[PDB]
Design a protein around this ligand. Structure first.
Ligand SMILES: [Zn+2]
Lengths: 1123, 57, 58, 58, 58, 57
């Protein structure tokens, strides 16, 4: 029924692109509409008041749904204001089951909030990654009430699975032929008019699917399961839609998931991105309440433990630590427990140090499927031990079905074993099904199809057996107990796609690095101020706000620069808010921290320089713009010296009128028309640039990737190299402490470059660099601008900085495994070094790098068009530096990169003599190993004055130091503090004490294993319950013994247990093959055998009603096999 | 054997923090071809099952 | 004269041309064309084959 | 997974066999039992009561 | 040479030829096993292994 | 324990004198039979001596 007497709908248009809440939407004036109208430009929202009156002849039809098929997404609200269910307009999710109280002609009313955008944004249909069309209109197709025959629905699922079985089973085995015969018998037994023929057809299909496939009991057969199915809904935060649309997608997907889990007692759901949980908690309290109720009920498992599903290549180490810290703290404060699995199924590449951070965050398991997209080298493993640079290991599993949005097809279950690459060590696998990339979760079709698949595997055992009542934790616990035999993978998991993601949207990456550095600086300064002065409150509110915004902008589609324009407008607003809050915090801290107001006519005796770096520093500062001084010191504040002697840094023109020689005390740079034709190191008397080549050379390539414009740069792009010649050099600055020449290069019409090459005065025992800054007016189309430095250093391996250490990569394209790495990600420096000498290219805003046989190449700018039509148009400020260093790669490059990314800022002070002379708060002794970087000093998360009340708080003041060695050798250090120390302990990333370390006079010593990230805390001065069981945990058994496990369970509930109420193995290590009043206790027994190996085995069980629903506590059997 | 509000789960696994040694994926065809030498009458007649077949003669 | 190989038992179904109507088949093993009957090796191999099918049912 | 498990069982048999010793043979048979079944060396393997598809006749 | 068996290209190098010394060194420290008559060497994740003697027969 | 004598079973596929195959890494076995004693004790050089029994003969 669809007419106006039965389904009457009014509409209200939201004012602009605003998204009003339910409170202020139902108070407006709705106007009558009907099916067939067209609604709104793209991204607008429309509210529908739908009044339904089920007619007299539909009141007893056994299934009533409201079919709503506006071709976009929507959300169903009850009259009260509770979200009920999502809807999607392609036909995927169009039905809302009437809640059994509409079965009387009382004309109940609901609301439907429709968002004028499809599941994948608003591209002009067909591509879904083309830039969104601002003038899309959506047609309301069908808005009717449908009485559906459940038997026809079940038969449809049955015959669908049967057809897939007849096609995908091997043609030479009897299973496919039997499936075909059953299909034929179904077809011949079905007649159009009759409805009993449907029941007869279902009975016929039962001979191949099993007796009762249409019930959850199919999962309680007690046979060995091989494929674990878990529901999943991957909502990208800002991929092809603004962030507000993501806020809406989260609720409109999790509401559908909660409704489904009400209907299907075996469905289990996982969703990551604690940030989305926070959005749901803030904006839709009822939806969050029902989600939390599901979480406590043992379904709807939150895993991932990170703030967002962040990219792991670009963000610095502290960003990754913050991701884990905030995610785990949110999960622990809101839900009871803390995640043990790192969920990251959509990230472009994984840094080599990720397993160490995971192990330090309490997460020993890792899941991902992105590496299946490699288009050059097939990744060779499915389940393996991923080993970090330091040796910490996690268990990584990559679902053999190569999607996180598996359609739960028969083919997907088949491929979960046919494509398993690690069958030698283990045969179990995870099938992650749903509709990801902004979509809603699993649909009822997928759940029914999985039921049919398990029925098939139980009756004709050729499909791998699929199981649905378990969790990801169970599967990984089963894996963990045989992980000593798994294959290991050392180092980074390089993703061989989306290599242009390191360069696209340069503004976002520059902002991310600036925000990271500023946050580190501010945290250190605020820690010093809060410890020094008791009246200054540590600004935890503001720090939390800025960190949350930064981490959100580190999402695996925002930072990688692969989103639409509106997303980047919102991210720009986020970064502007972050920097304004940082300015406020810094002003407060400077007010407290002595006094550091501003810069005036300088005096070089009332001004200090902020250090914020944990080692003695000595550089040139630019006070009194004509003159300059030397800032040297060890603490957070450095004094100045105001040198004046014979002139360093000469610049002289050759008679060529265009060539310059910038001579330092350590370097000599011969600059031709824009390029460094020669670079002579006066310490190691050798030329850095090979004869005949030219360093700092702008080159341009044609990008034009295959499909993903913003993501990919393909290998063939290396063929279209073209040098930009148009330089003509002239003097720009000639002060006796700094010289610099400036050049203009014409990329093309309407696109040009202005480059400044500068040399600073050398200082005693400090390597000097050649600094380059470019103003690029960039308006090219599908071009790729890079800069080249041939460095005359022969080595097969180049060193790059990653999060918390050094990765090492080939430079020769020997095999496909090395040709796939033609462009890599380096954070702050890339080093090419032979035995006694190296050259480091160190930057401040660029991540793309490529070393190919003596030619370093820094990726500067890309101009894609697909998701964003004006991606990098405009003016860009780029900085890099060439640093030729004696000796192999050592602490010099690390310290220089940190100094390059953190320029000193000057600050006046009323008394800049006590401030300088005071010993630093925290430092490392000079005799300690220089490889140690004391990356962050931060106040503890729970200090009774920083707590915020989220979690239980500790008593005193505490300071957290994160120090890591950056070079990869055993590092000994002594940390000196002037704070009055009460105790020191080693902590993990979540700040949980591990062991006490000894300290003497605020001089505790640290030993760091290679690439370790040790952290130190400085403390300054139907219900059912378990009763008992026969065989305890950890009892020892014969290798192939036959035994029985007997639990006893008490009711402790108001309701009563139904008749059956058995235990039905929703767990891990399979060991099968041999009513109750609210007062008393019932014993339950299972028959088990010990497996064929000496190990520990753990099986999880659960009480379940004899109709499918599981309840009560969780049970397990814990045994050890002696052999 | 089950939750009692004093124990949240089973005793935690002994998954080592550091990987002890690297282990590689076994090459399938080499291992497959190795098996036949355990009973074939080739050059290993005196070092495989064929040597153990006859107790005495 | 099937040698009662594992391959013969596998081919007794992989090469069955009438699986639509029936899936059972006869495996005739021995040493024909003037030879003697089955040897003990073949009988033991068939025992192992059934053990395999009972434990890992492929 | 069946072929890979068979390969793993074969490897475990090879590594458990030493030339001089004769108990290693019994240990190897016990290892193989995890893939062939408990008592493959007896006619009782044919009395498992499962559906047979190939009938072997000498 | 690699010491990790990451890919088949590295698993194929489970035993390599070194003339007079094999060195495993981190940033500030290393250990060298140096010999005078042996060429076979294998470094596999913190465990250097010097091949001493083989007894073939063919 | 460093300087540890280990023994493997070689048995390559075809080329006995040439090949050692990857699967040989699985049959690792340590030789334990040492029992150490002094061999040389000069003020410029010390050395201990040990006997390890690989097998009979
Ligand atoms: Zn995504």
């Amino acid at each position: 029924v669809s007419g106006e007497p039965h389904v009457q709908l009014w509409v209200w248009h939201a004012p602009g692109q605003t998204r009003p809440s339910f409170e202020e939407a139902v108070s407006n004036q709705f106007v009558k509409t009907n099916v067939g109208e067209w609604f709104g430009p793209s991204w607008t929202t429309h509210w529908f008041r739908v009044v339904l009156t089920v007619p007299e002849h539909l009141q007893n039809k056994r299934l009533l749904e409201f079919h709503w098929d506006s071709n976009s997404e929507g959300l169903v609200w009850s009259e009260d204001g509770k979200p009920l269910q999502g809807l999607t307009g392609g036909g995927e999710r169009v039905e809302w089951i009437l809640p059994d109280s509409f079965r009387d002609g009382k004309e109940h009313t609901i609301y439907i909030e429709m968002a004028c955008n499809r599941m994948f944004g608003n591209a002009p249909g067909g591509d879904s990654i083309q830039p969104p069309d601002p003038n899309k209109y959506f047609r309301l197709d069908k808005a009717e009430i449908v009485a559906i025959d459940p038997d026809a629905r079940q038969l449809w699922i049955d015959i669908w699975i049967l057809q897939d079985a007849a096609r995908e089973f091997p043609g030479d085995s009897w299973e496919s032929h039997k499936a075909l015969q059953v299909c034929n018998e179904i077809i011949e037994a079905f007649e159009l008019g009759n409805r009993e023929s449907l029941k007869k057809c279902r009975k016929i299909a039962e001979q191949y699917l099993g007796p009762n496939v249409d019930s959850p009991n199919v999962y309680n057969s007690g046979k060995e399961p091989l494929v674990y199915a878990i529901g999943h809904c991957h909502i990208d935060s800002c991929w092809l839609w603004p962030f507000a649309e993501t806020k809406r997608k989260v609720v409109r997907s999790w509401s559908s998931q909660c409704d489904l889990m009400d209907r299907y007692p075996e469905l289990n759901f996982v969703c990551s991105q604690a940030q989305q949980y926070k959005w749901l908690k803030q904006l839709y309290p009822y939806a969050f309440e029902r989600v939390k109720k599901k979480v406590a009920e043992g379904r709807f498992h939150p895993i991932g433990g990170s703030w967002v599903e962040h990219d792991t290549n670009m963000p610095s180490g502290e960003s990754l630590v913050r991701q884990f810290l905030y995610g785990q703290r949110f999960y622990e404060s809101n839900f009871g427990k803390r995640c043990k699995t790192f969920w990251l199924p959509d990230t472009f590449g994984y840094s080599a140090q990720l397993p160490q951070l995971c192990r330090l965050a309490g997460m020993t398991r890792f899941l991902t499927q992105k590496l299946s997209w490699n288009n050059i080298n097939r990744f060779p493993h499915t389940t393996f031990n991923w080993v970090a640079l330091d040796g910490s290991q996690v268990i990584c599993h990559m679902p053999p079905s190569e999607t996180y949005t598996a359609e739960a097809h028969f083919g997907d279950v088949k491929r979960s074993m046919s494509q398993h690459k690690s069958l030698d060590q283990d045969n179990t696998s995870l099938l992650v099904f749903g509709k990801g990339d902004g979509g809603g979760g699993p649909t009822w079709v997928q759940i029914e199809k999985l039921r049919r698949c398990r029925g098939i595997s139980d009756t004709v055992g050729l499909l791998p057996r699929v199981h649905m009542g378990s969790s990801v934790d169970d599967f990984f616990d089963r894996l963990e107990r045989k992980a000593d035999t798994f294959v290991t993978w050392y180092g980074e998991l390089y993703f061989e796609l989306h290599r242009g993601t390191y360069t696209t949207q340069a503004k976002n990456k520059k902002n991310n690095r600036r925000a990271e550095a500023k946050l580190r600086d501010l945290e250190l300064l605020a820690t010093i101020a809060s410890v020094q002065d008791k009246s200054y409150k540590y600004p935890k509110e503001e720090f939390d706000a800025m960190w949350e915004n930064v981490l959100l902008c580190q999402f695996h589609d925002c930072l990688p620069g692969s989103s639409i324009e509106m997303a980047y407008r919102e991210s720009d607003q986020m970064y502007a808010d972050v920097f304004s809050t940082a300015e406020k915090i810094m002003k407060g801290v400077s007010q407290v921290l002595g006094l550091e107001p501003a810069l005036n006519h300088m005096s070089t005796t009332n001004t200090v320089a902020l250090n914020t770096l944990p080692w003695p520093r000595r550089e040139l500062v630019k006070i009194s713009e004509k003159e300059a001084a030397v800032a040297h010191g060890t603490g957070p504040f450095l004094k100045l010296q105001k040198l004046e002697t014979t002139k360093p840094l000469v610049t002289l023109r050759q008679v060529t009128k265009g060539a310059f020689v910038l001579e330092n005390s350590q370097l000599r740079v011969h600059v031709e028309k824009g390029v460094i034709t020669s670079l002579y190191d006066k310490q190691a008397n050798r030329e850095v640039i090979p004869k005949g080549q030219k360093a700092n050379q702008y080159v341009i390539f044609d990008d034009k990737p295959l499909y993903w414009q913003a993501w990919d740069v393909e290998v063939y792009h290396l063929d279209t190299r073209k040098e930009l010649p148009s330089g003509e050099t002239e003097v720009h600055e000639n002060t006796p402490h700094r010289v610099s020449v400036v050049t203009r290069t014409k990329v093309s019409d309407k696109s040009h470059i202005q480059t400044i090459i500068a040399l600073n005065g050398a200082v005693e025992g400090e390597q000097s660099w050649v600094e380059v800054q470019s103003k690029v007016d960039w308006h090219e189309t599908m071009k790729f601008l890079k800069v080249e430095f041939p460095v005359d250093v022969r080595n097969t391996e180049a060193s790059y900085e990653t999060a918390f250490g050094i990765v090492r990569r080939p430079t020769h394209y020997n095999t496909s495994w090395d040709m796939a790495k033609f462009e890599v990600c380096a954070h702050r420096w890339a080093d090419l070094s032979e035995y006694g000498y190296g050259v480091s290219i160190l930057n401040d805003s660029k991540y793309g790098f490529a070393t190919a046989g003596q030619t370093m190449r820094l990726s500067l700018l890309r101009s894609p068009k697909a998701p964003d039509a004006h991606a990098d148009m405009g003016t860009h400020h780029i900085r890099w530096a060439i640093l030729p260093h004696q000796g192999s790669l050592s602490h010099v490059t690390i310290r220089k990169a940190f100094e390059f990314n953190n320029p000193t800022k000057l600050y006046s002070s009323p008394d800049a003599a006590a401030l300088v002379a005071a010993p630093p708060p925290v430092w490392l002794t000079p005799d300690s190993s220089p490889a140690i970087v004391l990356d962050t000093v931060k106040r503890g998360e729970d200090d009774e004055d920083v707590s915020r009340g989220e979690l239980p708080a500790r008593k005193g003041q505490s300071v957290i130091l994160r120090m890591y060695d950056s070079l990869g050798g055993l590092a000994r250090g002594t940390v000196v503090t002037t704070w009055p120390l009460k105790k020191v302990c080693k902590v993990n990333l979540l700040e949980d004490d591990l062991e006490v370390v000894p300290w003497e006079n605020g001089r505790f010593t640290v030993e760091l294993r290679p690439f370790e990230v040790a952290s130190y805390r400085l403390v300054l001065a139907l219900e059912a319950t378990f009763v008992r069981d026969t065989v305890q945990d950890g009892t020892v058994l014969a290798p192939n013994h036959l035994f029985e496990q007997t639990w006893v369970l008490r009711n402790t509930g108001k309701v009563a247990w139904p008749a059956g109420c058995s235990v039905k193995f929703v767990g891990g290590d399979y060991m099968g093959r041999v009513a109750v009043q609210p007062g008393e206790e019932a014993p339950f027994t299972v028959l088990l055998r010990t497996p064929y190996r000496a190990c520990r085995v753990i099986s999880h069980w659960r009480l379940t009603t004899p109709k499918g629903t599981k309840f009560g506590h969780r049970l397990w059997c814990d045994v050890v096999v002696e052999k | 054997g089950g939750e009692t509000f004093d124990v949240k789960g089973p005793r935690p696994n002994d998954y080592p923090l550091r990987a002890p040694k690297p282990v590689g994926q076994l090459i399938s065809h080499i291992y497959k071809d190795r098996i036949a030498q355990f009973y074939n009458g080739g050059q290993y007649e005196h070092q495989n099952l064929r040597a153990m077949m006859k107790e005495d003669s």
